[PDB]
mmCIF file with all atom_site columns, C-alpha atoms and ligand atoms in Angstrom:
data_model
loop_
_atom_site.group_PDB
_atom_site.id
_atom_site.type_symbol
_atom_site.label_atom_id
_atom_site.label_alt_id
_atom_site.label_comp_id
_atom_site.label_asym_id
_atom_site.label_entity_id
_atom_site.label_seq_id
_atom_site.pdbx_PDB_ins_code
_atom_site.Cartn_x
_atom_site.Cartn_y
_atom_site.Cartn_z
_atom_site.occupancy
_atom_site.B_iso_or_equiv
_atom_site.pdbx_formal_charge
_atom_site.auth_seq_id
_atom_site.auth_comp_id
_atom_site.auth_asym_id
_atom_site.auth_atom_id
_atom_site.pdbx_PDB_model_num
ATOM   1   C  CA  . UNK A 1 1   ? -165.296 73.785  -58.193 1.00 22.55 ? 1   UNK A CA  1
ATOM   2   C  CA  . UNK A 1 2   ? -166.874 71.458  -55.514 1.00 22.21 ? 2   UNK A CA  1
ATOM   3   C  CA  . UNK A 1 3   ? -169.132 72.895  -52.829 1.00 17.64 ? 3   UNK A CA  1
ATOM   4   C  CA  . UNK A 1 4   ? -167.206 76.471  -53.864 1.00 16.86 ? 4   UNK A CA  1
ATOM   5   C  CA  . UNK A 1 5   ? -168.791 78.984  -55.646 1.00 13.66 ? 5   UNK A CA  1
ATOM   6   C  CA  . UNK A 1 6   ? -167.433 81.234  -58.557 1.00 14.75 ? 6   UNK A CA  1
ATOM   7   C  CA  . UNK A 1 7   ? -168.368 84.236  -60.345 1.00 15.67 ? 7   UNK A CA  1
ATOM   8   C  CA  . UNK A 1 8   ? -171.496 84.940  -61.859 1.00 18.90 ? 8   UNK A CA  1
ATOM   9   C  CA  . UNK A 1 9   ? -171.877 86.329  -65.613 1.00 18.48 ? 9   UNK A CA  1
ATOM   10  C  CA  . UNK A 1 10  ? -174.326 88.784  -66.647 1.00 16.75 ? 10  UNK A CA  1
ATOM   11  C  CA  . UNK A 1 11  ? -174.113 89.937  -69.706 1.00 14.44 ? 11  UNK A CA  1
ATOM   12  C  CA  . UNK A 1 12  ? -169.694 89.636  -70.228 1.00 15.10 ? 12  UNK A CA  1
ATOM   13  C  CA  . UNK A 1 13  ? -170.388 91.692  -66.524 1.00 16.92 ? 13  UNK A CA  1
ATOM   14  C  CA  . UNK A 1 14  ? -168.248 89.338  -63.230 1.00 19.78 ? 14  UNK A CA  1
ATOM   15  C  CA  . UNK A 1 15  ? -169.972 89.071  -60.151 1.00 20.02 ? 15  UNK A CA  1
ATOM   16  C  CA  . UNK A 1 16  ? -168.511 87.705  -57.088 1.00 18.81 ? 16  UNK A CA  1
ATOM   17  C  CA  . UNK A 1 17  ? -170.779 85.230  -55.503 1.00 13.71 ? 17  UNK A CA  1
ATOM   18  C  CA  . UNK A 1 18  ? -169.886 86.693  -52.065 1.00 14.31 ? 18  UNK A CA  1
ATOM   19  C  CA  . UNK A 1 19  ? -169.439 90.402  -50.983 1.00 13.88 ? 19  UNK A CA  1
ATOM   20  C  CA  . UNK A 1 20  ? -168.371 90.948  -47.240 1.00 15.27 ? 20  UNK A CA  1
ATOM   21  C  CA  . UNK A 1 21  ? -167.645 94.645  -46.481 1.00 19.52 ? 21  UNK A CA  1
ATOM   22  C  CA  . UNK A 1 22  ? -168.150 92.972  -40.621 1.00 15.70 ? 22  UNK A CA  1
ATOM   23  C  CA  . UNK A 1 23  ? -170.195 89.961  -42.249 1.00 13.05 ? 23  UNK A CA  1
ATOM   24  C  CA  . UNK A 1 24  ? -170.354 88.322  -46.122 1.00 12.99 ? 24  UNK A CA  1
ATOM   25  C  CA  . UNK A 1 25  ? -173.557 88.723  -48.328 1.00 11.77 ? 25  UNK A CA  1
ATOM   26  C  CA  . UNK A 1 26  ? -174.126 86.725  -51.165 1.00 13.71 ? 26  UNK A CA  1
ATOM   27  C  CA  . UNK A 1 27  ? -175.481 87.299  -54.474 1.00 15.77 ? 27  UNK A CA  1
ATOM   28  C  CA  . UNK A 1 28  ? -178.864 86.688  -54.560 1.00 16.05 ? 28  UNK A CA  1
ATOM   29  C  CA  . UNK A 1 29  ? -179.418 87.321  -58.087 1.00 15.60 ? 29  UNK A CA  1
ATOM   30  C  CA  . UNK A 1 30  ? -178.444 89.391  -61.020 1.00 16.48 ? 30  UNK A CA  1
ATOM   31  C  CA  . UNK A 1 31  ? -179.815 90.664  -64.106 1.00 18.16 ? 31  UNK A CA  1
ATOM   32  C  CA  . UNK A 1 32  ? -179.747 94.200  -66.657 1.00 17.62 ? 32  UNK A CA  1
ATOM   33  C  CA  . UNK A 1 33  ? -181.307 97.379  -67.067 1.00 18.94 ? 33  UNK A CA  1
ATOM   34  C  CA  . UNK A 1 34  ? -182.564 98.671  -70.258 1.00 19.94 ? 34  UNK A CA  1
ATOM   35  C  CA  . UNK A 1 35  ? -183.520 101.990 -71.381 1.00 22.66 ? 35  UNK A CA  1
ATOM   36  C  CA  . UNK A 1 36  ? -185.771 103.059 -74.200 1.00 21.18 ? 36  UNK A CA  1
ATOM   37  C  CA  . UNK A 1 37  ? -184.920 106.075 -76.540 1.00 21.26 ? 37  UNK A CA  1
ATOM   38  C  CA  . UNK A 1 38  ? -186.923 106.670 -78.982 1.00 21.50 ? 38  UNK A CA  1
ATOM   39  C  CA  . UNK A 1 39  ? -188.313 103.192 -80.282 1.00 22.39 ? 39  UNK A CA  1
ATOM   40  C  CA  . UNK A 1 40  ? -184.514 101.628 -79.406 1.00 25.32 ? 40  UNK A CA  1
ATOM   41  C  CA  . UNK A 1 41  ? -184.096 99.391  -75.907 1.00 21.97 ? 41  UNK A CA  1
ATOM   42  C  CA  . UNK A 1 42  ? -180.846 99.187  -74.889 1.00 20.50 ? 42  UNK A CA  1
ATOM   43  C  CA  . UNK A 1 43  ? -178.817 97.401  -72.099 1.00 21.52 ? 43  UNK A CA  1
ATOM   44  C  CA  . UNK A 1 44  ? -177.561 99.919  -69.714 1.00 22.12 ? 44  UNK A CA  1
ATOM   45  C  CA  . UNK A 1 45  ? -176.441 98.428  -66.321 1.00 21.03 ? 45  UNK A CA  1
ATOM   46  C  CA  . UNK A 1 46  ? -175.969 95.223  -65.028 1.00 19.74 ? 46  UNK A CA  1
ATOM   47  C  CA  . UNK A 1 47  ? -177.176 94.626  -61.493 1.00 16.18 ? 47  UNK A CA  1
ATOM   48  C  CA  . UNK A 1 48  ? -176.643 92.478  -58.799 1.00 20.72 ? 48  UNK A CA  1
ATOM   49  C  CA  . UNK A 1 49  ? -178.545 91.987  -55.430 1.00 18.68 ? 49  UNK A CA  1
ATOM   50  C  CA  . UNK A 1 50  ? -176.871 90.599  -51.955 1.00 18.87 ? 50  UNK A CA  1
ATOM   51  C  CA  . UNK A 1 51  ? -177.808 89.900  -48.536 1.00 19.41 ? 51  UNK A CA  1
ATOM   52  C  CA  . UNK A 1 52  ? -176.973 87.800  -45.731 1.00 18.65 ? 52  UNK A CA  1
ATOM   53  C  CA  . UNK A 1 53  ? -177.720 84.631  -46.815 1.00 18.67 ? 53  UNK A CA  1
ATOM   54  C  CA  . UNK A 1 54  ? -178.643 82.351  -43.612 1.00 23.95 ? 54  UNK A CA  1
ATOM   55  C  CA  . UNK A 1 55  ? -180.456 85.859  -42.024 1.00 26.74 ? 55  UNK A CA  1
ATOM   56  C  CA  . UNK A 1 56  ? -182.884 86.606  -45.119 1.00 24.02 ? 56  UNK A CA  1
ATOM   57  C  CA  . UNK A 1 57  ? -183.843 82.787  -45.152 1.00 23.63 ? 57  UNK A CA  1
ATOM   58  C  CA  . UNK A 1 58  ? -185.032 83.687  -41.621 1.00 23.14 ? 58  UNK A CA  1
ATOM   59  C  CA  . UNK A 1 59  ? -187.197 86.128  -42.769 1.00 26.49 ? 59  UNK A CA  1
ATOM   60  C  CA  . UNK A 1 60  ? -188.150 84.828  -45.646 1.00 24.61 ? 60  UNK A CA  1
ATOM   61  C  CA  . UNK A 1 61  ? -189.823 81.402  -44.166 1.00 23.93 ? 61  UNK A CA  1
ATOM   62  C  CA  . UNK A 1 62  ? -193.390 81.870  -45.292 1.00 24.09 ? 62  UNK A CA  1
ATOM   63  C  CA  . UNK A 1 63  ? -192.325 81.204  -48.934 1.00 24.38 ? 63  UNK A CA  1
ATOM   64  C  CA  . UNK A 1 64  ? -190.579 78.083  -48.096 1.00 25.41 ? 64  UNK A CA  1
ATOM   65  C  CA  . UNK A 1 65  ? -191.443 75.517  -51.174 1.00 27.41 ? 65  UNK A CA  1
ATOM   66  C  CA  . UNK A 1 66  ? -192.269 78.453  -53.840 1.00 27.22 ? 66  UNK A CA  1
ATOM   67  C  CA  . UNK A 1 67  ? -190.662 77.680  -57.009 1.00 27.49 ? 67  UNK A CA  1
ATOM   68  C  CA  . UNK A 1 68  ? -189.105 80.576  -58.510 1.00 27.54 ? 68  UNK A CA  1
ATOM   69  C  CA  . UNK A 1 69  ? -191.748 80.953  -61.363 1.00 27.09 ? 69  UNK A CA  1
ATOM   70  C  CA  . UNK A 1 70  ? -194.328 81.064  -58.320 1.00 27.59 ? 70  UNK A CA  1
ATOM   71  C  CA  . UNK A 1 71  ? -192.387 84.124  -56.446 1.00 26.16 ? 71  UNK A CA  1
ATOM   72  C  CA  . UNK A 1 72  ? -192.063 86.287  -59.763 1.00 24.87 ? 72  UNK A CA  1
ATOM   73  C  CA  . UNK A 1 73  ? -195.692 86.478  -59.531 1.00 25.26 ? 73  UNK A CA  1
ATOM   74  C  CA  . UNK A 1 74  ? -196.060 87.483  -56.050 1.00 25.30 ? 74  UNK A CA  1
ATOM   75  C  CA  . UNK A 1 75  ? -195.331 90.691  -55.775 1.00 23.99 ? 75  UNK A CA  1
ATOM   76  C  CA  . UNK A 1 76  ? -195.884 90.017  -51.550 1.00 23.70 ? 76  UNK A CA  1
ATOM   77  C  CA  . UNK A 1 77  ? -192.892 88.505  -52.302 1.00 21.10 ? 77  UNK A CA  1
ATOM   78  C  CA  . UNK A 1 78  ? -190.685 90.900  -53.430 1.00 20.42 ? 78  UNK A CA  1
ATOM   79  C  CA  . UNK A 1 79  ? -192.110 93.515  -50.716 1.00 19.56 ? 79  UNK A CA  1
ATOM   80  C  CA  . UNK A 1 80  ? -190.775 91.466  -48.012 1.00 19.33 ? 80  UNK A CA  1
ATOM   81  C  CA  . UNK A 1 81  ? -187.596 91.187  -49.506 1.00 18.69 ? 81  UNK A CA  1
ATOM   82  C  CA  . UNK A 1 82  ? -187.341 94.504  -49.755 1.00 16.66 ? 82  UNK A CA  1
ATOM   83  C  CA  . UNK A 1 83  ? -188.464 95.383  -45.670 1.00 19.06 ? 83  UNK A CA  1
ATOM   84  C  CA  . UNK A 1 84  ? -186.285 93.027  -44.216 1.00 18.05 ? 84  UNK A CA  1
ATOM   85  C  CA  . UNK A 1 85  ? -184.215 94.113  -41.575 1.00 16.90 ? 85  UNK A CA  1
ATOM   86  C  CA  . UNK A 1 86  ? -181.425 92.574  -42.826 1.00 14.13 ? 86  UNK A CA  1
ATOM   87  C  CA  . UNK A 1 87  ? -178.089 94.235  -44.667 1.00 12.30 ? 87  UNK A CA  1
ATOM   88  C  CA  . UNK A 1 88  ? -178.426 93.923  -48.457 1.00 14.01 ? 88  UNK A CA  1
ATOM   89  C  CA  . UNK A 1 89  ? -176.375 95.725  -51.112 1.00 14.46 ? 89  UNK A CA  1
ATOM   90  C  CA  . UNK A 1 90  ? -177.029 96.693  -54.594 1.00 15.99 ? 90  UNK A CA  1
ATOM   91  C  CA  . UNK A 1 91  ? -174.118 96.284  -56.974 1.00 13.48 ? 91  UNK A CA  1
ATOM   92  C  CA  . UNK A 1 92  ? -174.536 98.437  -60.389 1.00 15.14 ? 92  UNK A CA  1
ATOM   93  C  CA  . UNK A 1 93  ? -172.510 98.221  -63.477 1.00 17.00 ? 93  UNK A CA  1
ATOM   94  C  CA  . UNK A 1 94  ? -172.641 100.087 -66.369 1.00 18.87 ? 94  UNK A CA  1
ATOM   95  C  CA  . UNK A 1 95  ? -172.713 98.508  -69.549 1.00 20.92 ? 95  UNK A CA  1
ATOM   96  C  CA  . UNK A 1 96  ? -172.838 101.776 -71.058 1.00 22.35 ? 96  UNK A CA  1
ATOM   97  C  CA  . UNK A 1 97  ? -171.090 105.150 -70.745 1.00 19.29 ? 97  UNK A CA  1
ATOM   98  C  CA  . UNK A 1 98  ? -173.642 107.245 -68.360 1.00 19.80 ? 98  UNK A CA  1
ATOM   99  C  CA  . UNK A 1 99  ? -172.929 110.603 -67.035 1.00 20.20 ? 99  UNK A CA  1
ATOM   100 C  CA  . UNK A 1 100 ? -174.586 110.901 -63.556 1.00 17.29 ? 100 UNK A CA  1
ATOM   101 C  CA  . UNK A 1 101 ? -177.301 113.021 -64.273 1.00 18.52 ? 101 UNK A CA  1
ATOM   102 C  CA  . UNK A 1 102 ? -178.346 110.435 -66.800 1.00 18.71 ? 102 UNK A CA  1
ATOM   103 C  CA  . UNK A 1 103 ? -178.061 107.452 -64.375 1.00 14.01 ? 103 UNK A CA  1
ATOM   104 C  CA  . UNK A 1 104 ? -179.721 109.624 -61.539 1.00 16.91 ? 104 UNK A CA  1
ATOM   105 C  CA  . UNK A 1 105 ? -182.607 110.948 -63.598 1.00 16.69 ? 105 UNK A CA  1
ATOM   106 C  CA  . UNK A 1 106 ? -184.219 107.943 -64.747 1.00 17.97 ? 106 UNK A CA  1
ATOM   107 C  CA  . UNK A 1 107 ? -183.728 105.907 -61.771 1.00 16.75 ? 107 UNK A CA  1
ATOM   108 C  CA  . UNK A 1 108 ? -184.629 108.952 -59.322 1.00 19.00 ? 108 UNK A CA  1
ATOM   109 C  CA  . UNK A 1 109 ? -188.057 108.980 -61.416 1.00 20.13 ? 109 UNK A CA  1
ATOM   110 C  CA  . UNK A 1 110 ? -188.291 105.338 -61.010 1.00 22.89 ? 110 UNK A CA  1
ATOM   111 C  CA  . UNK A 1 111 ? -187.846 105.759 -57.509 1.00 26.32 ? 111 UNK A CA  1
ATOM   112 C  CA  . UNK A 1 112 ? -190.199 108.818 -57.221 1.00 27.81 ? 112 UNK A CA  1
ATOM   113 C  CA  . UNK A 1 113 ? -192.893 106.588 -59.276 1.00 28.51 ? 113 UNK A CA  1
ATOM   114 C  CA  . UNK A 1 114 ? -192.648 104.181 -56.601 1.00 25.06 ? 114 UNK A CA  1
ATOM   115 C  CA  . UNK A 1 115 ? -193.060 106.303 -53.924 1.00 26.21 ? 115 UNK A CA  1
ATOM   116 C  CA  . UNK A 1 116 ? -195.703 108.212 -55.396 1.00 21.85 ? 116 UNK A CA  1
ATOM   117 C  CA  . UNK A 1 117 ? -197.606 104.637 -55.986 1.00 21.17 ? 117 UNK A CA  1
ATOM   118 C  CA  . UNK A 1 118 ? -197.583 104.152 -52.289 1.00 16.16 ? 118 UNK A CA  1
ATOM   119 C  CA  . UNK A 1 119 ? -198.617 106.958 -51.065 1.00 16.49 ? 119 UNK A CA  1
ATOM   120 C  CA  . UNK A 1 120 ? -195.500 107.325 -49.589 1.00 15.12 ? 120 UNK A CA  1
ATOM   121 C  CA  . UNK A 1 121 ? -193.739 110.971 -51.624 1.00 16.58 ? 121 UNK A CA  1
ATOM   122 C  CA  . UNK A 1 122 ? -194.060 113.681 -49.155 1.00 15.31 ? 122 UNK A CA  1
ATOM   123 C  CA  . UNK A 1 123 ? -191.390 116.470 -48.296 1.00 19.03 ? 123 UNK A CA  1
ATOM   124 C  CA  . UNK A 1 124 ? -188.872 113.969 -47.121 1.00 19.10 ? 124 UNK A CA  1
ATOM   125 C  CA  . UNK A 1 125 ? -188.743 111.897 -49.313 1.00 16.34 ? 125 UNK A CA  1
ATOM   126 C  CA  . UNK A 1 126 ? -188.544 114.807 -51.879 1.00 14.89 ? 126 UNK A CA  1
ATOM   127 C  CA  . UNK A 1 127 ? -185.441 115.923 -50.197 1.00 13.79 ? 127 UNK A CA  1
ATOM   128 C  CA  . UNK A 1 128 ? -184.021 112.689 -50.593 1.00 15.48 ? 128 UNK A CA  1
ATOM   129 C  CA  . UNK A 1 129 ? -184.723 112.966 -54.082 1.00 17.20 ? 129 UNK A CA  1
ATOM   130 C  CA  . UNK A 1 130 ? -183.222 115.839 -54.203 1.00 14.32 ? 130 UNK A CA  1
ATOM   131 C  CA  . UNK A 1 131 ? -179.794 114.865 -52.069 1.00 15.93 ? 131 UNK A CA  1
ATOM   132 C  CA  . UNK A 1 132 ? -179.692 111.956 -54.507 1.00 15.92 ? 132 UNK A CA  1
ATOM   133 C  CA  . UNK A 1 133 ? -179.607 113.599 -57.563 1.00 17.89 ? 133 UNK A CA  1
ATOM   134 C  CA  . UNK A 1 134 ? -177.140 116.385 -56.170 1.00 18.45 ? 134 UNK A CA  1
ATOM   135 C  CA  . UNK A 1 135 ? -174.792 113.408 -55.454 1.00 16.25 ? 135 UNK A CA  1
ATOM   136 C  CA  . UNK A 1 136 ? -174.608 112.217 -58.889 1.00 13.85 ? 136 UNK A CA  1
ATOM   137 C  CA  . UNK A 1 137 ? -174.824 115.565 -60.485 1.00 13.66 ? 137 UNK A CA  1
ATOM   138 C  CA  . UNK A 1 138 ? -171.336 116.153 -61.573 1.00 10.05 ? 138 UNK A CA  1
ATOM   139 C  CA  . UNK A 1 139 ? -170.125 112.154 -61.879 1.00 9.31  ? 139 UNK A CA  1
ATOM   140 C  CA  . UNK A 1 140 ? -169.436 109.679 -65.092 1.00 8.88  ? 140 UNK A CA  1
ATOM   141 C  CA  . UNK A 1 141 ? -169.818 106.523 -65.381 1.00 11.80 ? 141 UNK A CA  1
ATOM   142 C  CA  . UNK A 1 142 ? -167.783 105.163 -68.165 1.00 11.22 ? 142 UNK A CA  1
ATOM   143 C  CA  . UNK A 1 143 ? -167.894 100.788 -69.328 1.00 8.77  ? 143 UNK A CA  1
ATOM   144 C  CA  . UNK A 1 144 ? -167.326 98.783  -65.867 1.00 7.32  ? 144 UNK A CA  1
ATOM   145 C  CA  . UNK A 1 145 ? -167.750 101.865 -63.581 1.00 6.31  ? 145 UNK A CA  1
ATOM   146 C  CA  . UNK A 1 146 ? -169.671 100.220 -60.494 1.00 7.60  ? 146 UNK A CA  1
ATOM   147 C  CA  . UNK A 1 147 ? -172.314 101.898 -57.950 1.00 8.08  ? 147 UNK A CA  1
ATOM   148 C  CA  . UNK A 1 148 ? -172.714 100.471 -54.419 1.00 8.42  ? 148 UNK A CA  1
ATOM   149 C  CA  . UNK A 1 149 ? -176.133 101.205 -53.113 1.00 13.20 ? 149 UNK A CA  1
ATOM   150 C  CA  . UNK A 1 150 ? -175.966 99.309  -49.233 1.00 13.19 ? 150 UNK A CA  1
ATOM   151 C  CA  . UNK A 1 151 ? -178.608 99.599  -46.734 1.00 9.72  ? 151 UNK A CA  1
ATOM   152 C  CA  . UNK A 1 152 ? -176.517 99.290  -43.538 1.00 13.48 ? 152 UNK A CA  1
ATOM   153 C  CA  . UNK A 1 153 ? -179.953 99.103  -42.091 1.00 10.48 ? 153 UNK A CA  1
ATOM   154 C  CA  . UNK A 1 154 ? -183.325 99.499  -43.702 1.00 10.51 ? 154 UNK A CA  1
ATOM   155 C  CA  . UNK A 1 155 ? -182.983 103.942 -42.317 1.00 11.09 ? 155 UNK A CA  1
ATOM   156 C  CA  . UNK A 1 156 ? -179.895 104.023 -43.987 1.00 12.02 ? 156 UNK A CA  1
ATOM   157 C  CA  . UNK A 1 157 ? -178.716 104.043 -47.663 1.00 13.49 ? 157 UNK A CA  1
ATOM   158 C  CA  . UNK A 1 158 ? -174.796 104.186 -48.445 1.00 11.86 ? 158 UNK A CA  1
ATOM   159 C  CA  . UNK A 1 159 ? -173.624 104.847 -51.688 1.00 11.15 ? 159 UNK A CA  1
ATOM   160 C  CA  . UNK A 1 160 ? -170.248 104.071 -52.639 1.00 12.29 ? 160 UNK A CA  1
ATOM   161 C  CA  . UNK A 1 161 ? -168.617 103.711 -56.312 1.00 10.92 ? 161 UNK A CA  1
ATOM   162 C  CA  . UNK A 1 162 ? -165.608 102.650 -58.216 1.00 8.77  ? 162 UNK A CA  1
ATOM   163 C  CA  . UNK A 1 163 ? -164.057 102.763 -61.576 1.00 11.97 ? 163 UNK A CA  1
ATOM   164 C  CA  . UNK A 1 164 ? -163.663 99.194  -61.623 1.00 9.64  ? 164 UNK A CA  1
ATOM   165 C  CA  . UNK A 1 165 ? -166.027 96.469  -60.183 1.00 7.37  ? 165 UNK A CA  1
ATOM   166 C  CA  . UNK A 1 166 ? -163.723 96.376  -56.513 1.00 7.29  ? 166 UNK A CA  1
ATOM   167 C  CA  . UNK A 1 167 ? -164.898 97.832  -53.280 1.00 3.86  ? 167 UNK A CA  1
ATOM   168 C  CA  . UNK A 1 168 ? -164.435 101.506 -51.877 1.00 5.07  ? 168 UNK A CA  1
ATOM   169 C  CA  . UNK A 1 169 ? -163.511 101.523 -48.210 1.00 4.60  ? 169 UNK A CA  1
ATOM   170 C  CA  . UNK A 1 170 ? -166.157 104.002 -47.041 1.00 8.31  ? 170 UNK A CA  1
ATOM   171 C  CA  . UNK A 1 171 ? -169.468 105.280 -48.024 1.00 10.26 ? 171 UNK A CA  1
ATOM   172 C  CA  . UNK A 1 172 ? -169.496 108.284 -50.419 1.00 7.91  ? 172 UNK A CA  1
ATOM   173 C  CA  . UNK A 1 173 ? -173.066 109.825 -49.827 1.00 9.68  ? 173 UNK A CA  1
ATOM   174 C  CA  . UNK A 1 174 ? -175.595 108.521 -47.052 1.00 8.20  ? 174 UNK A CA  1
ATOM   175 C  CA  . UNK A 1 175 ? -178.984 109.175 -47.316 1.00 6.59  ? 175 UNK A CA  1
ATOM   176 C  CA  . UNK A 1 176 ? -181.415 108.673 -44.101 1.00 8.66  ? 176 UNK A CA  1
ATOM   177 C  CA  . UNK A 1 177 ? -184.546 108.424 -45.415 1.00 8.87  ? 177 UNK A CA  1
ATOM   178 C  CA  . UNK A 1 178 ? -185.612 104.964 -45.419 1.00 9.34  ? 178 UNK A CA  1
ATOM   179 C  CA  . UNK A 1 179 ? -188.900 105.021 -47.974 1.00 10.09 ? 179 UNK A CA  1
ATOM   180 C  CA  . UNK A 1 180 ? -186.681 106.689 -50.393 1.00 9.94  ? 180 UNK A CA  1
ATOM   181 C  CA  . UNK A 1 181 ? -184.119 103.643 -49.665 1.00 10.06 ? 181 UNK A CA  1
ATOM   182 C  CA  . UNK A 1 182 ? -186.543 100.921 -49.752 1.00 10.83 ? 182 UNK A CA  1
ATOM   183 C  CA  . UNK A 1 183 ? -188.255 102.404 -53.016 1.00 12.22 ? 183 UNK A CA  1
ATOM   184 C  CA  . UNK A 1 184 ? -184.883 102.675 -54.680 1.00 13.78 ? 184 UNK A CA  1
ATOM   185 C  CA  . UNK A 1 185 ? -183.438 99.290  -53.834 1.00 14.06 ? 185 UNK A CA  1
ATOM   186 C  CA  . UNK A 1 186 ? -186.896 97.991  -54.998 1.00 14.83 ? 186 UNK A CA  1
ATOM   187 C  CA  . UNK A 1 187 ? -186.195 99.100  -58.356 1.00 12.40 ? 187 UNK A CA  1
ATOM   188 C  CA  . UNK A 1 188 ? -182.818 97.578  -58.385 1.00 12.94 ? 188 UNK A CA  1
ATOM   189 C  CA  . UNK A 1 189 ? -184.649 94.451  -57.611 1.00 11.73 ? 189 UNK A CA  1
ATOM   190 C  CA  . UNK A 1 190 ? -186.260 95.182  -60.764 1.00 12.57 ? 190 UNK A CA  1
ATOM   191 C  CA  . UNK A 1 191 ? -190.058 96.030  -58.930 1.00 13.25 ? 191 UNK A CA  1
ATOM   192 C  CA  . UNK A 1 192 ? -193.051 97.296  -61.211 1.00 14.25 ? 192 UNK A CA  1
ATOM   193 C  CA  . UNK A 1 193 ? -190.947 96.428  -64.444 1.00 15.46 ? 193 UNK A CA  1
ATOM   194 C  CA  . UNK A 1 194 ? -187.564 98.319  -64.433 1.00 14.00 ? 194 UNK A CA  1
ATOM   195 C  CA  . UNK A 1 195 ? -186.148 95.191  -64.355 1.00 15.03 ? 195 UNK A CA  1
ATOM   196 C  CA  . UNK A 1 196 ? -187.676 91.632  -65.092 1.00 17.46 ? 196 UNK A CA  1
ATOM   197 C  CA  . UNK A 1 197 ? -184.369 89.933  -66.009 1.00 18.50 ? 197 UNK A CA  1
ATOM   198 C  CA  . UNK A 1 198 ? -183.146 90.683  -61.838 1.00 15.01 ? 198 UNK A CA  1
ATOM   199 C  CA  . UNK A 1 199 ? -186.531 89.757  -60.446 1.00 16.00 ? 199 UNK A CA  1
ATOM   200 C  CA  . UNK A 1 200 ? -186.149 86.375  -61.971 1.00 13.65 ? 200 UNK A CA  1
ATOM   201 C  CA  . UNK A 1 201 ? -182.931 85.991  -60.797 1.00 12.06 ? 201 UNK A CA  1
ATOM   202 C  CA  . UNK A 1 202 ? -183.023 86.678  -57.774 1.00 15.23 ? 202 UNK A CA  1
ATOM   203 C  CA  . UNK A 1 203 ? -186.262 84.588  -57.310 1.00 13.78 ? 203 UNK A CA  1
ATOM   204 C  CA  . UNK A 1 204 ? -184.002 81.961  -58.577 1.00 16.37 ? 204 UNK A CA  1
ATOM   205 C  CA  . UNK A 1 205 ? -181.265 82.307  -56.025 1.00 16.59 ? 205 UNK A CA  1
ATOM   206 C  CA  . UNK A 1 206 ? -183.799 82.779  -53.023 1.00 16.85 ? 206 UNK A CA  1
ATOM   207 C  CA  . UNK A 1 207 ? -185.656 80.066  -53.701 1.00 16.28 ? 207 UNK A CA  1
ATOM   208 C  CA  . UNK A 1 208 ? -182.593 77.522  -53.594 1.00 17.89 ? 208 UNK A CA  1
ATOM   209 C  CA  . UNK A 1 209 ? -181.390 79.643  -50.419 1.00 21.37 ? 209 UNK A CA  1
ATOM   210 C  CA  . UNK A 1 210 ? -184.799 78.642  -48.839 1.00 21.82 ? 210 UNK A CA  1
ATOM   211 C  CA  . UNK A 1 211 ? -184.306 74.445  -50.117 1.00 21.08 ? 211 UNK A CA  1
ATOM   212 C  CA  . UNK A 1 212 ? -181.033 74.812  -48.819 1.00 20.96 ? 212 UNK A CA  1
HETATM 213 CL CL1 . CL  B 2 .   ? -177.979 96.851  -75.870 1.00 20.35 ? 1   CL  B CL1 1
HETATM 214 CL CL1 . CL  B 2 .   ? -179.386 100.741 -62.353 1.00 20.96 ? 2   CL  B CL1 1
#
């Protein structure tokens, strides 16, 4: 289409290239979520990773001429990603039927690993555990349901969600904890292997935003 961009496929999943819920973040990268049971992996969610574009190249700066395959392996990289004060949104799609407590218990453990890693899982951040599993408690996420995890700021995580892949017009749940924010959004960057496939990407789609 020209200099216009379109949607981006991942895995039969649309995402727009652009989100703007006042100011327009763009799709950094996108990629899936497995799950093992048993000895079976399967595809679970499809996620996708925004910011504003021309604001995280200003914090970004240092890894200016990286090649993406260079940035997957520095996990520096991904950290600052994460701490940037900048707005960035997490855009989740099951692939899969999920019922909340199933989305919210592996990923809340993912989180908590994270945390826990760091030093970083005391009594607050428990709590936010705790408020984020009560939010998701009695949901279900059938095919093409969509979660909206958006840190406002870094303090602040909003979560939103739909039945389809369009926007709600207000938070849901806000949680103001911001370690238990930046651990979970670093897992929906895919951090310490949950997922691989949206590390790469969004490698990808920083390291043309820094060229550009
Ligand atoms: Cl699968
Ligand atoms: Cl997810």
């Amino acid at each position: 289409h020209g200099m216009a961009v379109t949607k981006v496929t991942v895995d039969g999943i649309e995402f727009p290239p652009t989100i703007t819920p006042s100011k327009s973040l763009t799709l950094l990268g996108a990629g899936v979520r497995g799950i093992q049971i048993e000895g079976v992996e399967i595809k679970v969610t499809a996620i996708g990773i925004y910011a504003e574009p021309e604001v995280i190249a200003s914090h970004l700066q240092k890894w200016k001429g990286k090649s993406a395959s260079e940035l997957v392996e520095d996990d520096g990289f991904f950290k600052d990603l994460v701490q940037a004060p900048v707005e960035k949104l997490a855009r989740v799609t099951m692939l899969k039927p999920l019922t909340g407590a199933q989305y919210s218990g592996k990923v809340g453990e993912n989180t908590k690993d994270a945390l826990k890693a760091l030093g970083k899982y005391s009594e607050a951040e428990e709590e936010a555990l705790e408020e984020f599993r009560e939010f998701f408690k009695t949901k279900s996420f059938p095919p093409g349901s969509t979660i909206f995890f958006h840190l406002s700021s870094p303090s602040t995580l909003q979560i939103s969600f739909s039945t389809d892949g369009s926007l709600p017009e207000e938070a849901e749940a806000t949680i103001e904890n911001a370690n238990f924010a930046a651990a979970l959004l670093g897992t929906m960057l895919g951090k310490n292997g949950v997922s691989p496939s949206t590390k790469a990407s969004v490698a990808e789609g920083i390291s043309a935003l820094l060229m550009k």
